[PDB]
Amino acid sequence: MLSRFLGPRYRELARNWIPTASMWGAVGAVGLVWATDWRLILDWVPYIN
Amino acid sequence: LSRFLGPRYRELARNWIPTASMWGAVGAVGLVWATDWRLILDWVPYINGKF
Amino acid sequence: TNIRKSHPLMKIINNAFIDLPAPSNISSWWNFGSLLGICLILQILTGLFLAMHYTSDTTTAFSSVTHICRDVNYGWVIRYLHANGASMFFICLFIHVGRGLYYGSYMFLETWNIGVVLLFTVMATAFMGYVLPWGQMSFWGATVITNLLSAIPYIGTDLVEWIWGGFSVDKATLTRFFAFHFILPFIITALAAVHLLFLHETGSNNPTGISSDMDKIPFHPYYTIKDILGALFMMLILLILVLFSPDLLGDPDNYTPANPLNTPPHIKPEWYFLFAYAILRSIPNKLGGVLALVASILILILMPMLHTSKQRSMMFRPLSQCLFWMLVADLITLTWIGGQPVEHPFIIIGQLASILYFLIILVLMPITSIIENNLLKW
Amino acid sequence: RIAEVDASVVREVCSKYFYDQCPAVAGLGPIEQLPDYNRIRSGMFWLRF
Amino acid sequence: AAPTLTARLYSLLFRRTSTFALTIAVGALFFERAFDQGADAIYEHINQGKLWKHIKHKYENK
Amino acid sequence: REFGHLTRMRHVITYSLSPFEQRAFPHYFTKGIPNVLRRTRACILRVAPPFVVFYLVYTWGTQEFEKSKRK
Amino acid sequence: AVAASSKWLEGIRKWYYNAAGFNKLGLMRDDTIYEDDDVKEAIRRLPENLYNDRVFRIKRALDLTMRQQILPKEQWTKYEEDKFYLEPYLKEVIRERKEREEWAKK
Ligand code: HEM
Numbered sequence A: 001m002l003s004r005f006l007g008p009r010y011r012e013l014a015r016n017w018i019p020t021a022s023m024w025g026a027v028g029a030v031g032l033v034w035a036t037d038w039r040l041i042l043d044w045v046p047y048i049n
Numbered sequence B: 001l002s003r004f005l006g007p008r009y010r011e012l013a014r015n016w017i018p019t020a021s022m023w024g025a026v027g028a029v030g031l032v033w034a035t036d037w038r039l040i041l042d043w044v045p046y047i048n049g050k051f
Numbered sequence C: 001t002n003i004r005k006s007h008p009l010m011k012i013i014n015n016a017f018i019d020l021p022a023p024s025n026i027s028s029w030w031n032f033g034s035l036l037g038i039c040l041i042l043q044i045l046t047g048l049f050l051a052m053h054y055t056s057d058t059t060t061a062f063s064s065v066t067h068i069c070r071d072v073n074y075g076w077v078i079r080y081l082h083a084n085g086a087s088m089f090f091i092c093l094f095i096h097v098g099r100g101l102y103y104g105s106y107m108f109l110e111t112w113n114i115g116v117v118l119l120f121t122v123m124a125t126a127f128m129g130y131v132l133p134w135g136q137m138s139f140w141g142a143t144v145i146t147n148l149l150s151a152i153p154y155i156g157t158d159l160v161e162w163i164w165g166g167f168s169v170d171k172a173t174l175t176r177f178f179a180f181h182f183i184l185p186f187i188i189t190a191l192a193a194v195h196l197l198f199l200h201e202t203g204s205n206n207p208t209g210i211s212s213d214m215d216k217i218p219f220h221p222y223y224t225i226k227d228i229l230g231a232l233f234m235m236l237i238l239l240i241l242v243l244f245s246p247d248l249l250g251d252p253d254n255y256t257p258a259n260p261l262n263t264p265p266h267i268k269p270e271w272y273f274l275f276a277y278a279i280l281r282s283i284p285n286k287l288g289g290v291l292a293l294v295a296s297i298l299i300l301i302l303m304p305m306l307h308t309s310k311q312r313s314m315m316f317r318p319l320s321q322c323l324f325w326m327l328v329a330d331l332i333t334l335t336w337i338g339g340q341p342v343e344h345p346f347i348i349i350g351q352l353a354s355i356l357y358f359l360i361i362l363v364l365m366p367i368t369s370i371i372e373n374n375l376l377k378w
Numbered sequence D: 001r002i003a004e005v006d007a008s009v010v011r012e013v014c015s016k017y018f019y020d021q022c023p024a025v026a027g028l029g030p031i032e033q034l035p036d037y038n039r040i041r042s043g044m045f046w047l048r049f
Numbered sequence E: 001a002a003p004t005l006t007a008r009l010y011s012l013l014f015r016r017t018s019t020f021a022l023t024i025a026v027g028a029l030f031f032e033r034a035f036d037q038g039a040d041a042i043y044e045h046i047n048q049g050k051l052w053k054h055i056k057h058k059y060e061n062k
Numbered sequence F: 001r002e003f004g005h006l007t008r009m010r011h012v013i014t015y016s017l018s019p020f021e022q023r024a025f026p027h028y029f030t031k032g033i034p035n036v037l038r039r040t041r042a043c044i045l046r047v048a049p050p051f052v053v054f055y056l057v058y059t060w061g062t063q064e065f066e067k068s069k070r071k
Numbered sequence G: 001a002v003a004a005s006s007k008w009l010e011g012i013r014k015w016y017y018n019a020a021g022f023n024k025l026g027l028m029r030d031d032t033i034y035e036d037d038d039v040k041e042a043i044r045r046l047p048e049n050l051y052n053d054r055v056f057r058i059k060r061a062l063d064l065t066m067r068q069q070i071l072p073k074e075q076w077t078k079y080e081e082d083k084f085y086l087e088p089y090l091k092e093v094i095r096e097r098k099e100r101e102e103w104a105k106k
């Protein structure tokens, strides 16, 4: 039923938005590492201990 | 002022003082029912509401 | 399409805050309406924290307030936010009323009359909360009001033995003071929504008094950024008081528990009730005292029909501006006299300044506006 | 010169000339509902990308 | 017409409109690394030999 | 009350400049000082004399409460 | 209505004109009136050229007040050149309202 998302040029629209969407998964890898102070990835970089 | 004075203003007040004392006397007897006004409760002693 | 104009919830937000037409020359005296709405939300959230640890019983009321300042974590910052946030509310409220009086905003009749109701309801709320800690000013403040509240001629003594639970002061006494004080700030919120609904019919006044439909600007972004900035400057001043002087505005005598047997050296309310207290003690009667206290807030509702000038605001009226600040310098006099003891110099000054508060509003202001009309040939 | 143009060329030249720039505006007649210049200038960028 | 160094970040990241709203999250790091060498260290310097952890050594050990 | 329905106006022209074309502080302490000296000179004689009357009553009032005591 | 000391009272009227400051924003006296329902009927009875002059003078003064500035002193409205353009239209609107009111009580 959801082959409205199935067009020859509709999957062309994923190619020009995933470079913006390649990155905000790494904001959660950096933003509540800030907030809730997770000690897992404070082991990672020698800037912070 | 004189914008409200005339023979027509208290014309309809003389027609509405019967609709006025009924504005007032109903609210005056409405004020005993609400807050159990006990010095006017037995104004007429037929209301023995307090047990 | 434009979802700001066709969605059922987003339409209401857009018509009220985003696309609202506003005058372009609005001053920072027009900032204090949203400051009052910030002060109200702050008092509600902080008060809902204190109510989980307070006990309304005259043997453990003073001890449950010392417990939160010493035992409960962050209880000392939240308690002194609440006491100092109430002084912040009353200083913004007096700026707000003085603005609408100087610039003639009372001509919005439905907006002005909902405002006089809101002024009574916050004054009664703040009175009930100052009884709850139950130190020696919560005691001698409660009894001064309720023996003055036995001078109502036919239902007076019926109403004084209702609020103490039936009695003198006991465990069930401050359950009614506490329940009134819980409920009234949520009625204040509902009356402030209706307050703004009637102002949305005309829009705002401006410092010139002259209508400005030819010069509107949208509310966003020009007054969304100007109101955020004034709110941050108000949270700065409030925290200067909480963190560097939390006992500056209070009285030391409320750190002694309530004792009918001991004696307090003076009776001094909070600073924002001191002007009303000075009008009370100038009337040697107890029916004419409670009348003149209630007639000093209720005189605001006569301001629309006492207006005899051809112009709306005081910007172009230089004789009405000398009388406006004679009235402000008379409320400063009545605040000072209300915190002094009752001896010879402070007894004639106190009653000659209670007369001047009613002589300016009722007599001298409507006569001065007619002299100004005649010097301009209308 | 027309045969060289494709969709990635069009996407590149439009971002160079339109995206985040200040426009010039002229208006005449019953124009009370012409939006404020601040509201026009904010329409020249999208907060997604 | 040699200009000054304003456009460090006008082109790369603060143009896409995303790190503009993401530097509340991505840009929330290493200033509680930095402004602790301020307030805390200024606090113990104005009050020298007056706090508990200054004087707690001579009551410590045994 | 929305924007294209407020009033009727003819023959007025408005010129404006972009915010990114402008300096933040053209004149700050070379017009900011003489303009507030104009606005202060206009208000002072309407606002100050009532508060000079509260001062002379405070000073006389807290001087007949001291001398009531100790002769 | 005094005849010998109406030189004294001509000077008090000039002093009050300058102490009020709508002339420093380039306004006339009838620009500053409070618009009730009576004044709003006199505005829509004005001829087109007098209505357009009033809309621009108000817009310019509202723009000076946004910036906390006034006009140069050579452009201040003088006391003898203030035209009371709205006063004859307002007297007629008020005179017609008194007549609908004496008719309704009698
Ligand atoms: C909790 C109490 C109150 C709240 C939250 C509140 C809120 C507001 C807000 C947000 C505005 C619009 C912005 C502004 O002009 O500042 C406003 C305007 C106004 N308020 Fe209040 N207000 C309160 C109490 C009062 C009181 C006590 C009065 C008068 C007795 C009053 C009278 C007015 C008037 C007349 C206006 C319109 C002023 C104008 O546009 O010139 N309000 N109020």
Ligand code: HEM
Binding pocket: C040, C043, C044, C047, C048, C050, C051, C054, C065, C079, C082, C083, C086, C089, C122, C125, C126, C129, C130, C131, C132, C133, C181, C182, C185
């Ligand atoms: C307009 C809103 C309010 C005002 C002006 C106000 C004012 C006050 C004041 C002046 C006190 C005395 C505090 C002191 O001096 O020690 C107090 C106490 C108190 N208030 Fe409020 N209050 C408000 C809202 C609320 C609300 C909404 C609640 C509860 C849901 C609340 C709960 C309490 C409690 C529990 C105390 C206990 C005594 C204490 O903590 O000192 N308040 N309030």
Ligand SMILES: Cc1cc(C)c2nc(SCc3c(C)cccc3-n3nnn(C)c3=O)sc2c1
Binding pocket: C016, C017, C022, C030, C033, C034, C196, C199, C200, C203, C204, C223, C224, C227, C228
């Ligand atoms: C930061 C912030 C956010 C919000 C959401 C906000 N909202 C208001 S209330 C807007 C209003 C309404 C709803 C109706 C009539 C008049 C006005 N109004 N017009 N001028 N001014 C100064 C006004 O407040 S202030 C404020 C400040």
Ligand SMILES: Cc1cc(C)c2nc(SCc3c(C)cccc3-n3nnn(C)c3=O)sc2c1
Binding pocket: C120, C123, C124, C126, C127, C128, C130, C131, C137, C140, C141, C142, C144, C145, C267, C268, C269, C270, C271, C273, C276, C277
């Ligand atoms: C509308 C209204 C209602 C009330 C009920 C009211 N009451 C006062 S004065 C009360 C007082 C006294 C006489 C002595 C010590 C302390 C306090 N007192 N009580 N609460 N607060 C904050 C105080 O300062 S004015 C006023 C105005």
